[PDB]
Design a protein around this ligand. Sequence first.
Ligand SMILES: Nc1ncnc2c1ncn2[C@@H]1O[C@@H]2COP(=O)(O)O[C@H]2[C@H]1O
Ligand SMILES: Nc1ncnc2c1ncn2[C@@H]1O[C@@H]2COP(=O)(O)O[C@H]2[C@H]1O
Ligand SMILES: Nc1ncnc2c1ncn2[C@@H]1O[C@@H]2COP(=O)(O)O[C@H]2[C@H]1O
Lengths: 390, 390, 390, 390
Amino acid sequence: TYTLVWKVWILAVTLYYAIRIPLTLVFPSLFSPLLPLDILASLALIADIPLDLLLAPSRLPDLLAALPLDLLVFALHLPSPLSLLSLVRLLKLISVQRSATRILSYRINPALLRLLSLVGFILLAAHGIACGWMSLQPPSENPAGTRYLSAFYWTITTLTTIGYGDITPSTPTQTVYTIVIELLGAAMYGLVIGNIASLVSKLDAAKLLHRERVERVTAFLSYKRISPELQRRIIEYFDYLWETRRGYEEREVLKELPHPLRLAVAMEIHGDVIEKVPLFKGAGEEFIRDIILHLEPVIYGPGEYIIRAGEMGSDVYFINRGSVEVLSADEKTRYAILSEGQFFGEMALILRAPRTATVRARAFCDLYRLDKETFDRILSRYPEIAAQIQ
Amino acid sequence: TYTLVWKVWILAVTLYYAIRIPLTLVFPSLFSPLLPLDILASLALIADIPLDLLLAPSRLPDLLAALPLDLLVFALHLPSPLSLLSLVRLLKLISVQRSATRILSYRINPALLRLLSLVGFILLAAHGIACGWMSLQPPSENPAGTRYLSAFYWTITTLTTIGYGDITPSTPTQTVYTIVIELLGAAMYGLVIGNIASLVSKLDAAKLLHRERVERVTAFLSYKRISPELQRRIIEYFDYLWETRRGYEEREVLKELPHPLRLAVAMEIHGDVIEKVPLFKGAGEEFIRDIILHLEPVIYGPGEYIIRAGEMGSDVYFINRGSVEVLSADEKTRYAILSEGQFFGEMALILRAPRTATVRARAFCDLYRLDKETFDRILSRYPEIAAQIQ
Amino acid sequence: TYTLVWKVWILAVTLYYAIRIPLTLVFPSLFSPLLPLDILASLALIADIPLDLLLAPSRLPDLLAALPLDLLVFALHLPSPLSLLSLVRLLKLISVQRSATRILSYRINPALLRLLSLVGFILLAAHGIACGWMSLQPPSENPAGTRYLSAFYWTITTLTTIGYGDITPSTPTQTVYTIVIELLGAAMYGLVIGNIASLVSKLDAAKLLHRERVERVTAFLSYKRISPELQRRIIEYFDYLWETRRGYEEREVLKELPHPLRLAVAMEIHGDVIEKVPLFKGAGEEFIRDIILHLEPVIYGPGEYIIRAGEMGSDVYFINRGSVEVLSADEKTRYAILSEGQFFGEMALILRAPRTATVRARAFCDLYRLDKETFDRILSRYPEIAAQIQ
Amino acid sequence: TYTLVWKVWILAVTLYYAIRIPLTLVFPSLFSPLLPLDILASLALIADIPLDLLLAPSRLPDLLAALPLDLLVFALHLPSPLSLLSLVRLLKLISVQRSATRILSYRINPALLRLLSLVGFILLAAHGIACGWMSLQPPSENPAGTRYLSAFYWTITTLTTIGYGDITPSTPTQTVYTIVIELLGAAMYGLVIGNIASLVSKLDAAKLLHRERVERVTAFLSYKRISPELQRRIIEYFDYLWETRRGYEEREVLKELPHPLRLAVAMEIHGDVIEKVPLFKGAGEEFIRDIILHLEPVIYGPGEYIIRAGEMGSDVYFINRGSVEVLSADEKTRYAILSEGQFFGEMALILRAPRTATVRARAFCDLYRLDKETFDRILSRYPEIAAQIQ
Ligand SMILES: Nc1ncnc2c1ncn2[C@@H]1O[C@@H]2COP(=O)(O)O[C@H]2[C@H]1O
Ligand SMILES: Nc1ncnc2c1ncn2[C@@H]1O[C@@H]2COP(=O)(O)O[C@H]2[C@H]1O
Ligand SMILES: Nc1ncnc2c1ncn2[C@@H]1O[C@@H]2COP(=O)(O)O[C@H]2[C@H]1O
């Protein structure tokens, strides 16, 4: 954090040169009561490169900007086709571009960074183009603010391709300059439209991808001639899965993690659920880490049957978010009502009994389940719990 | 539905302020026979925030729009660089933007919503820019409609980057204003082109993706030097799969559902097929739910061989949509003709006989099949049908 | 094919009305020596709808275009704000749009179709806008070609947002018309740029995706500090796989086929290879169809070792495209040289011998292999070949 | 490399014709002291086609460009509507386009190639349009440089859609030409904006896709109400995986290789690790090639537990890049510290002992592991090591 202020100071120095140098080439009446900032800024540019550490095809912009190739032009009054090498300092902006595109490349969007850098370079180049236009004008008595204001008005009318045409070229050497900045204006405005069209194309990704996958599963299920009630129930399921976890599927988000982080996330999620069961209590610590990676999420809508009383039944369910209710076989007498953190279906792993009660959802549930075959497979390799459950 | 009319009333109030305030800053001859709508609209803005429920970095637009920071300007006749804070009411449009982008974010496309909101803000800002241009004109006797019509003509000629140039700036304080709205005009027109290019890029998704996957499997099969008859048959298969179910594959559409909805969809699809078989009749209800999730779809073209008489043969087929015919071993005597809802190949699960007849397709079929190994695997865990089939 | 000429005739009729009606509203000196084509075209429009077969929210454009709502205007000389309903015929273009977007929606690209239809509607609307501009001009003696040519020059200067400004509005009722077609011109030019940017964005798909996956596997393997010789060999492998089969992977192209077409493609590919082996000769026809679906493709570069003499060895290889050579254990005495259609490694399925010769590639091979476990798995369920190989 | 200079010479010849022919149609005072380059360039065009090897719908541009359809026009002084067929030579640019789009289609980006070719054709067409505009001018005494400079200024003002309007059409036959090049100017500028918007849309792919997958796994894990410490640890893991291997996952990059190249890459990666173990030393060469394809990469953050002392433990770990430390059961006495190239956990494959020490990471590790079941599965089919480990 003591070099970020140095990068800001270097940006201020090269910004200062980009605003000053084409303005003092046109008006040589400057630079004389303004040499001290040249001295300070030149020392900053010549002291940046040791603190930037020396010969590369990506170092010579800073190296050519470092040497005082100006101040000789302005003290010795070099003529017009030879003074222009005092723009060599403006190679410094490539270094500031390549530094600001990496010091904050993830604090912000990478497309918005390029667009703001382009708007900065377009204003900072419209200043230079206005200075050039004001340079190759007929010499006449005119106040030096109102003859810059017309040149900047011209070079904004040309670059933004509006083109009023109220002030136009007269001589041929103005017309050649006008042709070349019309090409540059069309190029810069094409780059601005291209970066805006790239920035707003990827602006909605999850909210467009979810709209696509709910149009796919609807235009398909209308082909199979499905009932409209069930189709409305599927559409409200996808509305739930958008307005809670933004459309993303649970088992493909946390597959993009490595094994220790995926284990840590599963340990944080199933935290206050697995310190409740009177089957895994007194078990080992290395047994919870084997069952907790094989839990699979399912989402039950309001009124769905999770367990029907009288089925064979295999697998146990852990409630994570929603509610559920437990009903008898006739669905008349309510036994109880379960909530988050609890669990049901535990009398199917250890025992070959058939289901004893009907478990209907009440709201959307987001509940995790553990299969019978998977539990008895990763129970075989731990012997003490293989004796503890018998 | 009694608050959606309130959102429409708030939109009408802030629309009213956005059309009125820059028009009454220019003409102070208004506001005196038009104060009652100021009173009504100010009460609406000051009563919206309790019915919007209080301090956040996303609440202060509505809070700054709520207080009557105008009406003091217009009753006390504040001067020109100080009256402009009566535009503080125009911060209300951020709240209406953020409300209309969520109350109907799935009734319509999310890109078309942004484009229509941008066109609304561009017209509603061209009004304010025309009022500003008409403000900093030389004062002269001119009817107040025809001097607004020229200012709006100017600010549409500038923002849509056409730029006739028939009426242009004269003073420097007009030229600075013209430079800044040329920048804003280029920005707004870049945003319009960017949103149109984003809206028409994703306009054909299924009809372009299907065109790509029929060009991939054609430019590949022309490398392998395949016969042109079979290549024409593959191309007409992909024409069938576009013009019936829009290109989407059956086993990857309904993998994006959870287990109860996928079970309900499979139960609705194989409804009038599984209450026909004299093998699964009298079976349990929990057995149909296990076989009905393991049916796999295949599509047979016209004239394809589904079953050849004399093969070993393993698996059973359920017809869902098309037709099929049953032929003898010499393919001369037609036994029968099957249709949708029926089934063939049932004498391969229970018995180790070889195929007894040749089953040729007639049109495209869309028929579901059940493997022998899968059926005998999920038949082992139900004992009563494991005795019923013996 | 006798209704496609009818669609072309209907397109010619509505094109005729779109070029004629705004030209005869301006000049009423027409229509009198040109009524017979009105009669013929009106009969075509009133006879299209029975041959188009009757009330829908997508049928009423053709129904409103069908009734002769003109010819009454032009015979009875209805005044200026009432004659304009003779543009109701121009609703017919929606029907021609919706017909031409489906009769040839796969003969051509779907984006190029929309772009050509947009260019057609933009020229066909610039005609109407030029007729309107020529309508609200001051009446003066001027030849009727050179006063249409200036109106069309104006409405192309405005719509393509160039805006010379050599001829401009004068009256207020011209200025309102100019504001509204400046908005339409900016919209049409935004749509043209959006469709061109959508048409050239997806223009290279396989040639950009392949460039991405050869930059991914290079920027990754430079992290692992891999040798440059092997990295050059991988890059020339990807150059081979572009310049033969356009980058696409063999086992994911023909997974997008159903089982009978995938079986037919594999039967056509391994045609002159499987009628050569003295192991599968005399075997059943239903055995070739089981082995021919389990062949897996691999590609060996020039000089790679396919088989090393003295290894354990399990699997057999079928050559499809390239060449290969067979060398002895010291790689000095060349046994033979194999070509396409032949096969090696056959003395590993039936026997537990170790490899007897070293098989080096010569060019790129594109050869298919069959594993030992897969062959002995799908050999167990056919008993007669399970006795034939013993 | 002796035909690339021929392609450059052909490009120079057709460039020469594209700059010369519309300039000599306007000025017939040329061609007389400039016939020798016509002779040389015509011989080059008539000798290219045998060295290009003869009748196709993609050969006739070169064939029509080959015959001297000019030089007869310029020696016999053909009149104005008949001289224009001397532009038939300009069909040669299609051949140069189709040759330069394939000789360097992978040295550079395919979109940048199309954009540079479009800028070349737009300048090279602005020359021809300026020559046509200068052709249909009123004949007057004016120096032949300053009347070309105004025509080129006009055709750059029109094509880049700026449109000053300082010089405009006068006659009708100029106005028809101006309408048609306004359409062409709008089309060319739409193509330039479309290619720039396509070139900058795909400019950041890996750096935008990685930003998306770290926003997905964050907006999901904020729904599950995860602790902020662990969420910060996941975000710094994704910062590591960007700033080392650019976001790409190890097991899906080298799945895009065939089996010999994937074997060669794994052999180069695990080179100085597998010639260290006192378990696989003295083993076969065909055993290293079977274990080295089943190594699976995992990445441990700083401070993670790789092995906990006292667990059951199954699998062995090979360190590739980072460091690690070995601690005792109380995590007080440090046994040693391991580095890259070494390995730990070897006393779990051969023996059923429980873990003997706790292995904590120090920095990010990038270490490869081998499961117990996989090792004992691919150890069963090699008998001599199955006796060597006992
Ligand atoms: N009286 C009860 N109170 C709370 N939960 C119950 C009760 N009876 C059954 N359950 C739960 O509901 C389940 C239904 O059958 P299971 O064997 O799956 O296991 C049962 C218990 O987990
Ligand atoms: N006479 C028949 N009528 C209708 N269907 C038949 C007839 N004979 C055979 N099939 C069906 O065609 C199938 C061909 O052999 P399978 O053993 O698969 O089972 C046979 C029956 O399902
Ligand atoms: N003399 C030979 N001529 C042609 N092919 C051979 C010869 N010897 C071995 N091969 C092939 O090369 C293979 C090397 O060992 P295999 O046992 O895989 O099977 C061998 C044969 O398929």
